[PDB]
């Protein structure tokens, strides 16, 4: 079931609840040297998706690392590390507060799209004189 | 402490100077050199992790400025164009004051003429070809003279005077670091020393900005005596040169304030005790050289 409108600070638009990215490993490598068998990318992803789901459930109100610690753990240390990490990356606890505005209007508006000088791809505002017709066209 | 920032500085240097061509506009290179030396100016504390390479880099960076053409290799800069050549010596003082047994020591090894790093170092010195730090001396000898002593007054001096003293400071400091096979002497119809006339200028100013004047003149005198005696004793220890050196030393118009000036000095200001001692010992060495010459 889905019952909320979830936004994220766009630059984060590299994260995918399905997969992992070179970003986080360079920020949390301690699950990837394959040295500590009790840790693995897999349990990492488990924790990850679990927590993000939790937050996305009722994101209007905050979510603590202590919460997850109560819920599931294999460690406090790494748990906190990654939790605060995602916090930084706003994937979690980002919409804890709401802010609004009346937004008065100005001459530029999103529904304004007219004919005017253009920086984009080519366009020809002057077509052809008379003698151009003088060609054995295709 | 932004170990990251320092790594950045280091490798950026290692590129900009050893630059296989990937940079488009030389002006970009100038920009890099320029804002780099500036941001250096705003540092007044430690540097030189994995030092030696970085130390040589910074030296080449400051040496970037000033017109080249033994003897002094640097035409003194006609001070109406540049302002970075300033920043150069500014840093070579500030970021070099730390007598901690690292930086000074790195340059001291630069007197000479993972582990592969060491291979690199000498690799560049012979790739800069004797000695080299004489070039640093010559560079330091720029922006001071030949314009203020050639002006119409001593007031417009004070501006660049404020700038001047750190230079002499740097110089005498590095002369603590020269006390082995060399050939060095740097008063050979190359600068003379208007330092005496300059000292006279600041003196007349005294009895007629501030807070820098007395130290400037003092260290100027100390510089004179120390470089003199060090040259003499050095080529004594080597003894590769005829005693003509004395005669040679005795043959400078820019030297040895006249004893009449000493006398008249000894009377009027009476506010320069330490400076009086400076000139005193100076004249002492002068008269000594005169005597023991014969």
């Amino acid at each position: 079931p889905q019952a909320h409108e979830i936004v994220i600070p766009s630059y984060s638009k590299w994260f995918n609840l399905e997969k992992i990215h070179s970003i986080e490993v360079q920020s949390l490598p301690e699950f990837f040297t394959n040295r500590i068998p009790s840790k693995t990318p897999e349990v990492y992803m488990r924790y990850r998706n679990f927590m993000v789901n939790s937050y996305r459930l009722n994101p209007n109100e905050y979510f603590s690392v202590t919460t997850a610690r109560r819920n599931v753990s294999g460690d406090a240390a790494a748990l906190f590390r990654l939790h605060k990490f995602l916090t930084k990356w706003g994937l979690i606890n980002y919409q804890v507060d709401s802010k609004l505005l009346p937004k008065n209007i100005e001459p530029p508006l999103t529904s304004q799209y007219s004919t005017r000088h253009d920086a984009p791809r080519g366009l020809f505002p002057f077509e052809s004189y008379k003698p151009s017709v003088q060609l054995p066209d295709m | 402490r932004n170990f990251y920032l320092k790594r950045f500085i280091s490798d950026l240097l290692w590129l900009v100077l050893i630059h296989p061509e990937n940079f488009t506009c030389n002006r970009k290179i100038l920009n890099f050199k320029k804002d780099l030396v500036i941001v250096l100016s705003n540092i007044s504390h430690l540097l030189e992790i994995a030092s030696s390479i970085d130390c040589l880099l910074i030296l080449i960076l400051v040496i970037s400025f000033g017109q080249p053409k033994e003897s002094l290799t640097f035409n003194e800069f006609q001070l109406q164009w540049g302002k970075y050549q300033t920043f150069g010596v500014d840093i070579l003082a500030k970021l070099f004051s730390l007598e901690k047994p690292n930086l000074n020591y790195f340059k001291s090894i630069l007197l000479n003429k993972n582990h592969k790093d060491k291979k690199l170092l000498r690799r560049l010195l012979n790739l800069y070809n004797h000695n080299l730090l004489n070039d640093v001396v010559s560079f330091l000898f720029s922006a001071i003279p030949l314009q203020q002593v050639l002006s119409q007054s001593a007031d417009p001096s004070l501006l660049i005077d404020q700038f001047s003293p750190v230079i002499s400071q740097s110089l005498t400091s590095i002369l603590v670091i020269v006390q082995l096979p060399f050939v060095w002497l740097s008063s050979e119809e190359n600068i003379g020393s208007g330092l005496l006339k300059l000292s006279e200028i600041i003196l007349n100013i005294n009895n007629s900005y501030s807070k820098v004047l007395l130290p400037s003149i003092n260290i100027s005198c100390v510089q004179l005596i120390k470089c003199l005696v060090e040259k003499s004793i050095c080529f004594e220890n080597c003894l590769n040169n005829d005693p003509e050196i004395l005669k040679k030393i005795a043959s400078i118009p820019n030297l040895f304030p006249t004893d009449l000036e000493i006398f008249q000095l000894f009377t009027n200001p009476s506010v320069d005790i330490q400076i009086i001692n400076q000139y005193q010992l100076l004249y002492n060495l002068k008269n000594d050289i005169l005597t023991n010459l014969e």
């Binding site: - | 035409n75 030949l146 002593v149 050639l150 118009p253």
Partner: protein
Amino acid sequence: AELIPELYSFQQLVDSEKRLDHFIHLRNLHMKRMVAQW
């Protein structure tokens, strides 16, 4: 700036007398220091 007195950096140095008039200018600077100190 440096542009104003000279620009001689490299011109292919065809008929490289530029070194010579260079030296001339250098000795002019020499004479300049000379007269100043005189």
